[PDB]
Ligand binder design. Structure first.
Ligand SMILES: Nc1ncnc2c1ncn2[C@@H]1O[C@H](COP(=O)(O)O)[C@@H](O)[C@H]1O
Ligand SMILES: Nc1ncnc2c1ncn2[C@@H]1O[C@H](COP(=O)(O)O)[C@@H](O)[C@H]1O
Ligand SMILES: [Mg+2]
Ligand SMILES: [Mg+2]
Lengths: 397, 397
């Protein structure tokens, strides 16, 4: 048995960033940039008016002028975002003007040079680096790529993940009345969804029975298909099959929930494939995915910060620590204007009983409280470290 | 001009949750549940062994027994997750047993009733409500649906969003050398990406010129196509066209960045379509999308908490407040073990110059600092409210 910290260090040391690809602008969304992006022209590329009004020679000052290149004694109409004609050095917004006669315009104020003008390149200078390698592409970065005219982008791809379930007792989730000794396969749909939330392509390999030849054939098809990660759950015939096909780095971790977790590296007949022999118990299966698979997906996708967000929060109820195993205690956290100590902060409620077979303990859990192995009851209002496992922007108030 | 709070209250009052639909299990991921889900059978549906070992009569105690319904004086082999035979009331893990002879088994310990057995329904009782209406579906909820055998789910759908850009000066982002008075359309790709991040289908309506008949025809095609939301940017011919087609609730908001923002409700020739006439300036366009469109998408998708996560954080540098307009100041926030006051907390750095034309001010911005209109310089180490605008689980450490 190895601590979680060593198991992560081993996974980070074995895991390698995927080779970069060129994708279309909308396929680049969510991906990490594999090249720097430079503006080929300035923004704005011409002096642009900030307002609807008249382009003037600021020195002329208040007066009546004909509307027409702008020379002293003349003005020209401009619109927001339109170019300033040559010779004009300032814009007088339409509110500070009046049309005279049944074209002549009366400028009502004394303006200053460069007023209501965006000079060439004041938002983005030509050849300036607008985005760098290692930067994740969100909506604003798509806007910067579009501004710079980059519609084909070099990025790190997401890994392709194969997923299978193991068990003679499993039936498909479409099963109605269950026969003797049968349960619905819940890990596969759960892991397919968890991987879809990580924006990875999934290869669903179905239910495999507790049969060595059958599992070997499915693992071989997975390796041969070109996937980067294989997730199995249960049966940890899995560990011995992964030892035969490649290198197993660990098979047991000091943690609650669970204990078994096999991590292996296989060489395709060639690229390497990472394999996680996840525990069968639904809770341990999803907790191991959150702690060990998520940072691996991120690392393969070129994330420079693959680790999950860790915060400090206050317990809303007392929680019993385990005397030997450090726990990943499921919780529903929220930001409060008063966290219980007077100042604002995160607070956590337990999801109830934490048995590894109890999938209801994962229901609505947006964090994993890291409880050290002291054996003591942590009182309500005491502080703990917590790993955030679901979109912090989608957090309920 | 109306404050942002009133503009939001108006949008929340006009916006209506979409009619529910039935979708497949993987299409349900990310959606809000429109029905309660009940377990049709218990979990486990049979008494299940927690270990590999022997199902025994606990009262028999240590001794040698033949392996075979279990009666006193006999034992039966069981595997993890397999059913307990009738008559056995406890499981003795294989480590506390030994096979005797060249089948007979020696039970080495005195066990207690129900040891290493998951009784019928101990994880989920039959007919128990595992998920409720209004609950968002993540990976664990997909696992609970799969456990309960629900592969067709009643949910609230995401709205379909139409998007267009306006401007005689715009060219496609594929444009290489720009002609006089031309800029690349950056708002449309940015808004398509922002809406894709909200998991909504997009109808890309392209660039529309500053021509009343042309914009009317495109708005009519958008309304006729069945979309729930229309996003336009720039030209705010937009407001007068939205007044003619439906009801405009506001056209100007007291805020920095920007000022113009038209919100309208149109009736299709019938369902209602919400229209946001977003400001043309890239920054104002994305800030208005983050503040006003995101909670609208959520409300239409049946979210009971559509508001964004608001936290309290400390400034890493001084920031000048505006004397009249409350600002949505872009920042890069991170959780620190010491926020500057001794205890752990969020900290924020400004993205630099906040001009509405400067899209670089949105680059990597994961929060909007809510700066009240005091006109004073907020010193470094002082606290402010901040709206989190990007996945808190994807926050860089
Ligand atoms: N796909 C699955 N869905 C639900 N439960 C599972 C799945 N695979 C294994 N389990 C259960 O988790 C426990 C551990 O399984 P294993 O690691 O195969 O011994 C047993 O109670 C299994 O019935
Ligand atoms: N699609 C767009 N992409 C980039 N900039 C835009 C877009 N639409 C409008 N703008 C600019 O934003 C400012 C306001 O435009 P408008 O609201 O049309 O007056 C002007 O400087 C426009 O050039
Ligand atoms: Mg099994
Ligand atoms: Mg315009």
């Amino acid at each position: 048995m190895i601590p979680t910290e060593e198991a992560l260090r081993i996974v980070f040391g074995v895991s390698k960033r995927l080779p970069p690809v060129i994708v279309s602008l909308y396929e680049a969304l969510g991906k990490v940039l594999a090249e720097d992006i430079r503006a080929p022209d300035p923004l704005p590329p011409y002096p642009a008016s900030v307002k609807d009004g008249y382009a003037v020679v600021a020195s002329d000052g208040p007066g009546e002028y004909p509307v027409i290149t702008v020379t002293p004694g003349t003005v020209a109409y401009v619109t927001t975002g339109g170019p300033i004609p040559d010779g004009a050095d300032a814009v007088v917004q339409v509110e500070d003007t009046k049309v005279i006669g049944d074209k002549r315009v009366k400028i009502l104020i004394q303006t200053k040079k460069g007023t209501d003008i965006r000079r060439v390149g004041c938002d983005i200078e030509k050849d300036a680096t607008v985005l760098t390698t290692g930067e994740r592409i969100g909506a604003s970065e798509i806007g910067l790529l579009a501004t710079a005219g980059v519609t084909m982008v070099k990025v790190y791809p997401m890994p392709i993940v194969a997923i299978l379930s193991t068990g003679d007792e499993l039936v498909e989730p479409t099963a109605g009345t269950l026969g003797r000794g049968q349960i619905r396969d819940s890990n596969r749909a759960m892991l397919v969804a968890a991987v879809m939330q990580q924006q990875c392509k999934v290869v669903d390999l179905g239910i495999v029975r507790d049969d060595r030849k059958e599992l070997e054939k499915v693992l071989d098809e997975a390796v041969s298909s070109g996937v980067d990660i294989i997730l199995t759950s249960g049966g940890v015939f899995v560990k011995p099959l992964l030892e035969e096909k490649g290198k197993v780095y660990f098979s047991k971790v000091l943690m609650k929930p669970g204990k078994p977790l096999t991590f292996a590296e296989i060489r395709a007949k060639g690229k390497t494939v990472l394999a996680f022999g996840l525990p069968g118990n639904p809770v341990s299966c999803l907790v191991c995915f959150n702690i060990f698979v998520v940072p691996t997906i991120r690392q393969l996708a070129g994330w420079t910060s693959p680790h999950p967000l860790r915060v400090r929060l206050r317990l809303q109820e007392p929680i019993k620590s385990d005397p030997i195993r450090p726990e990943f205690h499921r919780a529903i956290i929220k930001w409060k204007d008063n966290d219980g100590s007077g100042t604002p902060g995160f607070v956590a409620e337990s999801t109830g009983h934490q048995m590894s077979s109890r999938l209801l303990s994962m229901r609505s859990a947006n964090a994993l409280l890291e409880l050290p192995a002291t054996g003591n009851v942590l009182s309500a209002g005491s502080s703990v470290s917590a790993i955030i496992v679901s979109d912090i922007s989608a957090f309920s108030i």
